Design a protein around this nucleic acid. Structure first.
Length: 133
RNA sequence: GGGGCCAUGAUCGAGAGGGACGGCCGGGGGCAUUCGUAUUGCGCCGCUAGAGGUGAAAUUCUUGGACCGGCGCAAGACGGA
């Protein structure tokens, strides 16, 4: 992708920052073509810290390297939590993965939050007495 | 059987009630219709090895392609803010 002055080749970064894991998924503008996808579990071997901000930081640094090899310079952030019937708050790996991209020599633009929210939800897991412990 | 006569005979309508009429009001009820994103399943494409879950793990699901991205198809619930 030869561009004059070396302009920003914008991509879309889908950050599935849920609990127990964190997906750092970078695609093209259409999202159909995956440039690079690495999760927090791919950088750690203990399942308890797959959602740790350190695990998401290593994934953001690895996905930032693959984008530079192909020509991607800027990223459109689309943060996403679990959403749907489950919780809608992003996990601890949201701020770490997003900040690690900005500190890895990448450009950030048009930050958004696409979390699946229902106009009317189905029945959530756990009885009417809830997950008691 | 025909007339005369009486001040000729009907208390009030309740800050009781029923009924009517008037312009409104309401997630009131029944029927029909429309829409909304989610959830699960399925098809095609992309990339890739884990993904699910937990205090920690395991059962389970994974190179016959899971989880994740995009496209749009079906079904039944439900009607968030």
């Amino acid at each position: 992708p030869q561009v004059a002055e070396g302009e920003n080749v914008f991509g879309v970064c889908h950050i599935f920052a849920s609990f127990n894991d964190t997906f750092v998924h970078v695609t093209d503008l259409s999202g159909k073509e995956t440039i690079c996808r690495v999760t927090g579990g791919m950088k750690v071997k203990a399942d308890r810290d797959e959602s740790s901000p350190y695990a998401a930081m290593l994934a953001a640094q690895d996905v930032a390297q693959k984008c530079k090899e192909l020509g991607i310079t800027a990223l459109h952030i689309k943060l996403r939590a679990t959403g749907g019937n489950r919780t809608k708050t992003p996990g601890p790996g949201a701020q770490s993965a997003l900040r690690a991209l900005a500190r890895s020599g990448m450009k950030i633009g048009r930050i958004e939050d696409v979390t699946p929210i229902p106009s009317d939800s189905t029945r959530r897991k756990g009885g009417r007495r809830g997950r008691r412990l």
